[PDB]
Design a binder for this molecule. Structure first.
Ligand SMILES: *[C@@H]1O[C@H](CO)[C@@H](O[C@@H]2O[C@H](CO)[C@@H](O[C@@H]3O[C@H](CO)[C@@H](O)[C@H](O)[C@@H]3O)[C@H](O)[C@H]2NC(C)=O)[C@H](O)[C@H]1NC(C)=O
Lengths: 335, 320
């Protein structure tokens, strides 16, 4: 291990140097930004709090994201004391969260830059299981179902998240000043012999730590490859290549009755470092979505999206239908 | 010259073909192709083709191992008997119950089961509908599983519901009968002693062929960072590397954090092709699978910026 540990350190240094170009290329910077103007001392109150929640454990829901970094912003809902109580007065099992659309356009000027928008809630009900549903205020009159969530009991207050990216993108398109969501308890009912059975504050609503929208978008200053593009175009870079395999013609096998063949495509092509490649084009950028130059020390043209293959074959007199995983290559990536 | 590029591709294509020869055999865990002298000539039986079709059928629904899974299916109890007299005249509810012994014959032991799907032939062509799936936990109760918003489609469509955990629990249970419930979505809200309630021909095909069934994928009976940091492995795996922006990169511009666990993948990916060449590609590499982002805080002049960079932290590695 005397002459192997030192070899390991060279790999670690190779990884570190790739990360140097890795971070700078993501930020679309040739060199680290100038610091002469920066105030010394601790970070501001809003900056630390913004960075805090990005690391915090949140509740998940259950096109692919790009290589370059996303600017994260957040907008807290309109304050509790004003406006949000008179229109929905005394609703026992419904929580309303409305946002100023101009505050969203201040963070994200145009919708095309927005890549993800999350609605955040500070859940408090520790001991009992609850089933909730999320709704979007499309118009002033009706609400539309978005999603639901079965919430198991948790001993500690937990931050809940709802992916409302598609909804917030439509909000950035609209000029209407106020938009919002509605979180209500799950309704369970059933009709039977002309009878009908029906079964049905949770979170911080005021000040800081009230519900908010977390926006991840490409900043304005900075404003994989599936078979549907790899089969049409001839590319020098890493991509999917067609290969139909006949169990008779190519493998000399007769025991697979169904199918007689399938498209087992392969990945083939050079994977240069993303910063070593020409200025970014939409067709070349896709490959690099999971790009981590130092991870494997040498990036390879490997598959991303794969599909299974069901087959039919015999064991004696007995026919068997089986499914094989990861047989069909649908996309390739450099990583 | 394209004459000497055709030849290069043919060599790559043959390497892929030869790896696939080993891939298929290794997934089925066979050393050589099985003997076919006893196989009946002619078309496959009625049930065998139908079972195979549904594996290919295009369906809309909302890690798995390397080796192949045996696919079986079990149709629900027929309409005319037993399943209507206890649920007589339910206007907005469709009931699907299954014999638990038929499931244990298809999947002998619950540990072997890897996936179970409930299949429905949707019929409502023109109208958008919202449905919910329920499980018969007890003799008195049903339990919420999932829901589905169904957009209009001109053609009858096969719907799928992932009921793996439910069907696996059925094999754990000893009760002879189990089943599901598909009902219309209930939307209500109470306000000042008032209450608004909204709901939403047969919804799906219910009798004869193409009736609801469970599609079972299980390992045959005959085939019977938290891991990378503890053990030292020669093969491809995750390797520890903490990176301090000052100590390792010489940087002062990233105020938060001062560093992070950016692990790397390292190890050769040159009978047991599960960790050797899972993808069967011409040259397998040790590349990461699970990646995690890294939020940072830095300054550009006077304006502080908090940004998130994707795929910075390697959590798992694979041979591909
Ligand atoms: C499972 O999938 C295959 C996918 O093709 C299905 O194959 C089709 O089976 C039908 C069965 O009737 C064939 O229809 C035939 O039509 C000709 C006239 O065109 C008639 O002479 C035959 O008597 C038969 O009725 C159809 O051609 C065949 N598909 C292809 C591409 O040939 C199969 O039906 C599926 N499911 C089953 C068998 O339940």
């Amino acid at each position: 291990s005397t002459s192997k540990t030192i070899d390991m350190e060279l790999v670690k240094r190779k990884r570190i140097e790739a990360i140097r170009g890795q971070i700078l290329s993501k930020l679309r910077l040739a060199s680290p930004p100038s610091q002469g103007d920066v105030p010394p001392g601790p970070l501001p109150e809003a900056v630390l709090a913004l960075y805090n929640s990005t690391r915090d454990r949140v509740a998940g829901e259950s096109p692919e994201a790009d290589y370059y970094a996303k600017e994260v912003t957040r907008v807290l809902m309109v304050e509790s004391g004003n406006q949000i109580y008179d229109k929905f007065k005394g609703t026992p099992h419904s929580l309303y969260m409305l946002f100023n659309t101009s505050e969203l356009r201040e963070a994200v000027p145009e919708p095309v830059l927005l890549s993800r928008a999350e609605l955040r809630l500070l859940r408090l009900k520790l001991k009992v299981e609850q089933h909730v549903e999320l709704y979007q205020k499309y118009s002033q009159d009706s609400w539309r179902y978005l999603s639901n969530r079965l919430l198991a009991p948790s001993d500690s207050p937990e931050w809940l998240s709802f992916d409302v990216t598609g909804v917030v993108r439509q909000w950035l398109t609209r000029r209407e000043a106020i938009e919002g969501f509605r979180l209500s308890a799950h309704c369970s009912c059933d009709s039977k012999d002309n009878t009908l059975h029906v079964e049905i504050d949770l979170a911080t609503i005021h000040g800081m730590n009230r519900p908010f929208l977390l926006l991840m978008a490409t900043p304005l200053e900075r404003a994989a490859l599936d078979t549907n593009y790899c089969f049409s175009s001839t590319e020098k870079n890493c991509c999917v290549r067609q290969l139909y395999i006949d169990f008779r013609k190519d493998l000399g096998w007769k025991w697979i009755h169904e199918p007689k063949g399938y498209h087992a495509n392969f990945c083939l092509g050079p994977c240069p470092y993303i910063w070593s490649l020409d200025t970014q084009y939409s067709k070349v950028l896709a490959l690099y979505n999971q790009h981590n130059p130092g991870a494997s020390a040498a990036p390879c043209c490997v598959p991303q999206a794969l599909e299974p293959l069901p087959i039919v074959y015999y064991v004696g007199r007995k026919p068997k239908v089986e499914q094989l995983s990861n047989m069909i290559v649908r996309s390739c990536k450099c990583s």
